[model samples]
Target: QTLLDALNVRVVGSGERVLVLAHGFGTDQSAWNRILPFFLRDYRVVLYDLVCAGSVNPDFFDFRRYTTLDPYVDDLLHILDALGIDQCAYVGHSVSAMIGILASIRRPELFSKLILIGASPRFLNDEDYHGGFEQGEIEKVFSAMEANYEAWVNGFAPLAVGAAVPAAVREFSRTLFNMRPDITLFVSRTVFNSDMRGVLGLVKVPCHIFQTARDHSVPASVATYLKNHLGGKNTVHWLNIEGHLPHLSAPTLLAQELRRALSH
Candidate 1:
């Protein structure tokens, strides 16, 4: 299968400029469905499911290869190459933000700008870093995922998607469960334990850190930390919208913020 087919890449917009929307850990490209139409007017959109997400064929997944984000970055680059796209505006949510950061760092020429939504460089707190969640809390989260997957889903889904639309939370829950219980825990661990702080200084493309004023998954302080530490041109867009998954809970506002960024 072609890379686009393998990764479920879809293009719905028509424009000379490109816009790639990447979802986070527990979600897939389908997460962008609500907000895509707003972008289609001005962007040629690209989106896909991560290798471990949803119902992706297990044959394409080699668990050993995903210990870090490198393989995913490679897959992302492969998709871009297959589409003959050298640069584009990248909008990444949560873990995808870090994946895009790594990809952009590897090839600065491949990105025109980056929009990081609800991103965290590290979810676990270090001595000086206030990464939001403590080690105990993150461990508890892992334990909860393995202990009662469905129960974990019930609570996390609402929190992740917020209550802006109760249906959205249900939808988020469904896609999250599409993965095997064990793989979900593994991916969760990989994401929460990842520390991308060391690489922040290497970013070269212009970036906009889009974040809610109060986020459950990502701390309010993380956005400022990222902006102050980034090596490239960056702006911290403090969203008036309130929710972790603004693209789902607040897509209209998310699109507005994106348009505002694009206007720059």
Candidate 2:
């Protein structure tokens, strides 16, 4: 109960089957609003704010504890235990996707399937891997984030959510601005600096990687990379959407792809 309250966990729908919706950076559980209705009639949906989410208390984001994704993975596992959910279908976006993957690897029985959207194992480019940004580019992002939070949000929101959906851009900007600048910067640093490549081969849970044709935050190479690297039954599906936040920009299309993924 305590965990649920602190995480702002909510359970809805009428089925015995459970579906967990984990949002990514710059957005909270509310990011799942547009896609909720589609699954409400068929599955029990769980939604919660990550510790670093704007809607969650800033103090919950301990810089030391959250330096790696382990603590976030613990929080997720605890949340499921508290809800008495022994098994579930996890739909995670961005960083949460890696969180789900970690959790599934930790306790394989807890997750039935992993549906990941715009997820990347690493953000900084490696010798042969193109995770997206270069070291210098990520540094510039960190500088921009620290120099002025609002400016970062204004510029990042449009690029992350895409200009095709002006409302999604505004929504993302508002959520990004709502977060405490210091915590947000720390999380940004953690996420961008993270490298889950070494552990990718340990994951055994079935995975469905969803990627937009073009994403400012993640590139197409990431989808193929994940499918190839993950040591599990994984397949990459290209969404017809344009940006990082497809659930926010193209809910119906995302829902359709989600339904197809869940069917198996």
Candidate 3:
């Protein structure tokens, strides 16, 4: 089983330090469109699509190999290794945020800092914790994926675009439309089922958790949960934004926050 090697990646900016930007589920690297222009002048940015989504080379998608998060995390590290990146800061959004956290914990010295946007360690509800989705609700999400992938895409498009989804969102939706329904279903299930609570305390690098106030995907409490469990002297910056896709909805604000995090 091979990882999706056909995944497209773009490197921009020019600086001594690198910023590896990772996108979340359902979408691809296009998720960073809003913030890309801002960082192009300063940071060396690395952006790529995760295996099952976007214009990934279909030949490289191995379902068996991607059954767990380890392979995906390995893919990120492998990308860094391939690019000769010895050290860099990780900027992850949604599920990608936790993936970055795990990668940093595994190789603390390789990562300078973690700038997590709309991050959550868990997405499903457990005792004393509210992840904004119950088991049944998540099950319904799976059903939605199976029943009508395109229809779901239409619904998700608005959310990901937030207040003003640019032409990029439409382009992103077209890419999402091209993904295999079954693969999308399986990937979604894997993401929701997996939990990274065990590795929180293992993180040694500084962390910056950026939480949107009214995000449908990641609730405020879940973001706080991540901050409380992250085993380091980390900073939690709560943003009073309205959508889950803050990078799209408020790029300037997100860029400003990222700059602040990098300064620390």
Candidate 4:
């Protein structure tokens, strides 16, 4: 498959400005469908399934190459290269947010602004650092993944979306349900174990860190930590919502916030 075909890239609208949407772990580009239409009128929209995304060609994913997020970073560049795009307004969620951070560092010209939703450089706690998760907790989470993948999905889908918004619960579950069991464990370890604290300061574009008070994954304090350490222009929007995915739980609010964030 060609790079475009292999990665399953989708582009919408005809506009000079580009808006690239990068999804997080487990979920694929389809995760952006709810929010994509909102920006399609004026901005060209780019959406692609990341490697290990269920629909993506498995042959494209070399486990060893994914030991760090470099592979994903390279993937983003290739996608942009193929599209003949040099710069984009990026919205990266979870792991993809960090991937965007790395990409922006390596190719500063490719980013106009980054809207990071529920992004975290590290998920595991270190000395005085609050990643919102303990090393042992993440270990058991991955262990549970390999032990009973289906059971883990059943439990995780709801928790990741949160019970506060009951209707969106099933939407997230559908996306998580499609993940391959083996790939599930593979990406889980890669995302959870990643540490991008040192790389945060290298980013050059203005960033809008969309955060919630508390998600099962990222804490509010981590958002505070990001604002303090980010090298470029930064702002944090504290959404009075819950869950790791605001796009799913509060799509309207997300769209409104993005419109406002992009304006500045």
Give me the candidate number with maximum lDDT.
Answer: 2
The number of clashing residue pairs in each candidate reads 0, 0, 0, 0
Tens-place lDDT digits, model 4, residues 1-264: 287889899999766688898988768888787887788788888899888887787777887787889989998899899889988899999998899999999999989999999998888888989887887767777888888877888788778887477766777767667777777788888887788999899887999999975588898899988898878999999987788988888888788888898889
lDDT of 3 by residue, 145-200 (tens): 68888888888777765656566457557767877878778887887888888888
TM-score of each predicted structure versus truth: 0.95, 0.98, 0.91, 0.95
Q: Indicate which candidate wins on TM-score.
A: 2
lDDT of each: 0.86, 0.91, 0.79, 0.85
Residue pair clashes in candidate 3: none
Reference-based lDDT, residue 145, model 2: 82
The CA lDDT at 261 in model 4 is 89
Residue 57 deviation, candidate 4, in Å? Answer: 2.4
Model 4 earns a TM-score of: 0.95
Clashing pairs in 4: none
Please identify model 2 stretches exceeding 4 Å from their true place: none
Note the residue pairs that clash in candidate 1.
none
RMSD of 2: 0.9
lDDT of 2 by residue, 1-264 (tens): 887888899999987799999999989999999999999899999999999888888877788788889999999999999889999999999999999999998999998899999999988887998877888767777888899888888888988986389999989888898899999888888898789999999998899999897798788888988999998899888888899999999999899999999998
